[PDB]
Structure 1
Amino acid sequence: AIFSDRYKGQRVLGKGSFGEVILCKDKITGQECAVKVISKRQVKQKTDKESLLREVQLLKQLDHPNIMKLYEFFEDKGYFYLVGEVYTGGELFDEIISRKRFSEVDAARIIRQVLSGITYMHKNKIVHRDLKPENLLLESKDANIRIIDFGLSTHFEASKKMKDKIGTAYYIAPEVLHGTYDEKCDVWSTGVILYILLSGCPPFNGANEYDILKKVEKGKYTFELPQWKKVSESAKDLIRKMLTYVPSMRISARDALDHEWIQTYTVPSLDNAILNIRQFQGTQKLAQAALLYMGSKLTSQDETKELTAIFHKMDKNGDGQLDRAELIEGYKELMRASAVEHEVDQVLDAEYSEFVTVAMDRKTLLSRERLERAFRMFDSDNSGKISSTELATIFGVSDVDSETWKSVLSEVDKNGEVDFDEFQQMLLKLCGN
C-alpha cells in the first residue's frame, strides 16, 4: 500500500521528535490526520522490523482519552509514515502562559490526565522515555490532553543534532542516560514538569546541555525558591516521591494517581510561576527557532546550488530562461508529484535565478517569521533589544560556544545589546555567512 495513494498533504505542522509532522487528508473521506514522517536516512533503527511492526499493531489497538490515537503505519524505501489523530489546541505550555490565573488545581487536573495516560500505557508495557511538555497536545480551554510520541524511543536511536535535542535534558530521567531504565523514567519526567508548573523553573538547570545533564546525574534539587512558599506540602511531597533517584524506590504512575494531592486538588494564583514559565518557554522557543533558522538557511543554500546546477543542465538552449514544464521536471529531479506541480504553480504565480531566490525564500520565511515572532515574544518589555545575559542563555541552550558567538557579536556590535536584525546577522555569521 502507498501512503500518497490514500493521503494528500495539506499543511506542515512542524518539526517533532524523529521527524517532521504533516497535516494530511484522506482522498476519499476528507478525514484530517496528523502524520509523522521519519527519514530512514536521518534515523537509525534500534530494533528489527518485526518488533517495530508489532508495536505499531498494538498501538493501533490501544485507546485512552489522554493518549494520541494511532490509525495507520506505512513504510517505503526511505520513510516510515505514522498516521494518527490531529489535535488542535496546540502545546500545553503556550496555553498556560496565556492565562489570568494558574493554581495547584490546574496543575493537578493536568497531571491527572498525564498520569492516567502513562498508567494506561505502562499497563500495556509501553514506555515514552522522551516525555516533555512539547509531547503534550491539547485536544481542542477544558479540552483533554493527548500525549504524543509514545513508543518511538524504543525503536529509534535519539538524534544527535542539536535542533532535535533542544530542551530534552531538563526532563530526562538519570537512569535513561546510563542505559538501565524502565517505565519509572516516565514518572521522573512527569515529576520535572510538575516542578515547573509550580515554580516556572526547571529543578535541574544550566547554561548548556552538559551542565543540566550533570545536575540530573547528581539528582539534587530544592524547593528553596520563595514561590515554593505558596505551594502545599503534599505537592512538594509528591514531587519528592516522583523525583526519587532509584527507580525501584520511585512511585509508580498508578500510585501517584492515588496521592493526597491528586485526590484533593481534583485557592490563590501562582503568578510568579506563570512569569517564569513564560520566560522559560520563550527562551526555549527562541533558541529552537534560531537553530531551525540556521538549519533552513543551510538546507536552502545546499538546495539552491543543487537546483541551479539542474536548471543549468536543463537550459539546453543557453539563454538563462526556461518554461514551466522544465521547472517541474527540474524540481522533481531535486527530490529524486501533485505537490510539486502545485508548489511550482505557486512560485510561478509570484530567468531561473529569480525563481530559485523566491522558491527558497518560501522556506526561508517559515522559519524567518517563526524567528521574528519568537524574538518579539521573548522581548516581553517590547524594548526591541536583547541583553548579553539573555544572549548567553539563548546561545548556551543552543550549545553555541560562548567565545564563538561573542566573537560574532563583536563584528556587528562594534559599539551591550542587540536588536532583531543584529541577532539575525549574528546567526548568518554563525552559519558561514
Structure 2
Amino acid sequence: SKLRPGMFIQNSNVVFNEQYKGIKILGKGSFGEVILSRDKHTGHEYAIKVISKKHVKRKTDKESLLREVELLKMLDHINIMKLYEFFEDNNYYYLVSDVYTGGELFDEIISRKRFYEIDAARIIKQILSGITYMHKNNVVHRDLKPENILLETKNEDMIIKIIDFGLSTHFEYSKIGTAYYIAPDVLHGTYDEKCDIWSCGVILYILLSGCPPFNGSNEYDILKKVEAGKYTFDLPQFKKISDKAKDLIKKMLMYTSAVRISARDALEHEWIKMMTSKLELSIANIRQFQSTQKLAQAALLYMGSKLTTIDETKELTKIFKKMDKNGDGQLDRNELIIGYKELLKLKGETSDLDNAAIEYEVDQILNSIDLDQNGYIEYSEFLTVSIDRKLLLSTERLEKAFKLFDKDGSGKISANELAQLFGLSDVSSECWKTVLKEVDQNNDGEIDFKEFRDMLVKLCNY
C-alpha cells in the first residue's frame, strides 16, 4: 500500500521483463496495481497490471493460464481491453494491456450535467457487443462490475472498455460494491456464460433508476436478496421508463440461467434497436448511489490507514531502536530504508519495485522535513511526519469523495446517510452513534465534513 496513483517512478528506473520501464502508477485494479510503462526499445507506452504471487493465489494450473492468455492475445474488439503479453518473475504476474485515460463508467456519468434513456442504451449496447464477442470465443468475465468498465479516452466520442475479462477464472485472493452485481450462478459454484448477462442486467437497472435491484446497507443483506432473486419496478423512476426497457431487464435478471437471455439476443432486443436507431433519467440517484460507495470506502481507507500506520510506527520504532547504537536518535538515510526492509523480512515477505516504493516513501518524508546537512535524521521526527503525511493523504481522498457526495447538498451529512456509510463499513450502530453525540453538539442530526472526519478519528480511538 505504498504505491499511490499519479506517483512517478521513472527516476527509480524500474524495469519489467528487461523491456518495460515503469514510469507512473495509474492506480489499482483487480488482483493488483496498474503501472504506466514504456517499451525500452520502441517506446510504446503500455498499462501493466502487477499481480503478486504471495497475496493472490491461482485457481488453475500453469498450463491453463498460458492457454487463456494466448487466446486473449488474439482477441480484438472495440469494447474489450487488449492484452499484449503475459510474463512472470519470482514475485509477480504481469499483464500488459493498453492505456485507457477515460476512467470508470459511473464516474463519467455522474460528472455529466444530465443522463438520458438514449445514453443508457448506447452504453449497454457497447457492453453487450463486447460480451457477445467474448462469449462467441468462449470467454466469460464472471466478475462484471462498473469498476471493470472503463472508457478509452476523455472524449463526445464515448467508447466503453471492458477490463479484467477472464482473470477471475484463474485468480483469487490468498471491494465494497461487488455484492450488487454478482450472479446467483456464481454463488452456487455452477456458473456459465449467462452470469455476465445477469451482471449486465443489474447495471442496466441501475443506469435507468439509479438504484440497485438487490439493495442493502450490508453485504449479508445484499447477498440474501440476490440469493432470493426478488426485485421490483416499484420505484418512482420506472414510472417514466419504457416497457421495452423493463422487458429486457426481466429477461436478463432471470434466476434460471437456461431461461436467461443470451448476449446476442439482448444486443438485438427491441429496446436497443429502437433507442440506438437513426426521457431524461434520474442522474441524482446514480450520483447518490455511487458517491455513497466512494465515501464509504474512503472512510474505511481513512480508519484503515490510521490504524495500520500506528502499528508499523510501533514496529519501526523497535527496529530503529536496535540500529541506533549511540542513542543520539539520529539515523542515516540508508539506515531508514533498511528499517523498512527489515519490517518486511520479519513478516516473511524484497522486490525491486517494492524497494523503489520504499525509497520513494522515505524521500517524500525527508522532503517534508527541514533536513540537517550532516546527513542524519531524528527517527522519532521521521515517524511523526510519516503519520501526519499519511493522515493528510487520507483526508484528501476523503475530501474528494465528499465533494462528489455533496455536489447538490446542504454541505452536511444526515444521520441516515451515516447509517448507510458505516453500514457498508461494517461498523456497529452503537459505535458511531455514541461518537455522533460527541461530534454533533447542537444536536442538529446533521454534521459537516470536519465533524465527519472527527468521527472517523474517534472511531479509531474507541
Q: Equivalences for 1:139-218 in 2 at 5 Å?
A: 139-140=152-153, 141-157=156-172, 164=175, 166-218=176-228
Pair 1:237-2:240 in alignment: no
TM-score (norm 1): 0.90
TM-score (norm 2): 0.85
Alpha-carbon distance, 1:361 to partner: 4.2
Match in the other structure for 1:248: 258
Match in the other structure for 1:72: 85
When residues 59 and 361 of structure 1 are mapped into structure 2, their CA distance, relative to the original with a 3 A threshold, is farther
Q: State the secondary structure of the residue aligned to 1:228.
A: coil
Cα separation, 1, equivalents of 2:179 and 2:342: 39
Match in the other structure for 1:280: 289
Compare 385-394 and 26-35 and name the one that shifted more: 26-35
Q: State the secondary structure of the residue aligned to 2:330.
A: coil
Match in the other structure for 2:375: none
Cα separation, 1, equivalents of 2:45 and 2:394: 24
Match in the other structure for 1:137: 150
Match in the other structure for 2:101: 88
1:3–1:74 Cα contact (<8 Å) kept: no
Gaps of 5+ in 2: 1-14, 345-349, 369-377
Pair 1:327-2:336 in alignment: yes
Paired residue type of 1:372: E
Q: State the secondary structure of the residue aligned to 1:172.
A: coil
2:183–2:199 Cα contact (<8 Å) kept: yes
Cα separation, 2, equivalents of 1:57 and 1:81: 14
When residues 298 and 125 of structure 1 are mapped into structure 2, their CA distance, relative to the original with a 3 A threshold, is farther
Cα separation, 2, equivalents of 1:7 and 1:358: 34
Match in the other structure for 2:59: 46
Alpha-carbon distance, 1:360 to partner: 4.6
When residues 41 and 400 of structure 1 are mapped into structure 2, their CA distance, relative to the original with a 3 A threshold, is farther
Pair 1:313-2:322 in alignment: yes
Alpha-carbon distance, 1:27 to partner: 3.9
Instruction: Report the RMSD for the aligned CA atoms in angstroms.
Output: 2.4
Aligned length: 425
When residues 409 and 75 of structure 1 are mapped into structure 2, their CA distance, relative to the original with a 3 A threshold, is farther
2:45–2:99 Cα contact (<8 Å) kept: yes
1:65–1:146 Cα contact (<8 Å) kept: yes
Match in the other structure for 2:421: 394
Match in the other structure for 2:366: 348
Cα separation, 1, equivalents of 2:317 and 2:461: 20
Cα separation, 1, equivalents of 2:41 and 2:315: 36
Pair 1:405-2:432 in alignment: yes
Cα separation, 2, equivalents of 1:296 and 1:373: 17
Gaps of 5+ in 1: none
Q: State the secondary structure of the residue aligned to 2:130.
A: helix
Cα separation, 2, equivalents of 1:308 and 1:324: 15
Of all paired residues, the percent bearing the same amino acid is 75
Deviation by residue 1:25-76 (Cα, 9 ceiling, x = unmatched): 3344443332222233333322222222222222222211111112222323
When residues 426 and 189 of structure 1 are mapped into structure 2, their CA distance, relative to the original with a 3 A threshold, is same
Alpha-carbon distance, 1:432 to partner: 4.7
Compare 26-35 and 89-98 and name the one that shifted more: 26-35
Paired residue type of 1:327: L
When residues 332 and 152 of structure 1 are mapped into structure 2, their CA distance, relative to the original with a 3 A threshold, is same
1:209–1:397 Cα contact (<8 Å) kept: yes
Cα separation, 1, equivalents of 2:150 and 2:215: 24
- One of 32, 46, 49 as aligned partner of 1:36: 49
When residues 339 and 16 of structure 1 are mapped into structure 2, their CA distance, relative to the original with a 3 A threshold, is closer
Alpha-carbon distance, 1:332 to partner: 4.3
Alpha-carbon distance, 1:242 to partner: 0.6
Cα separation, 2, equivalents of 1:122 and 1:365: 45
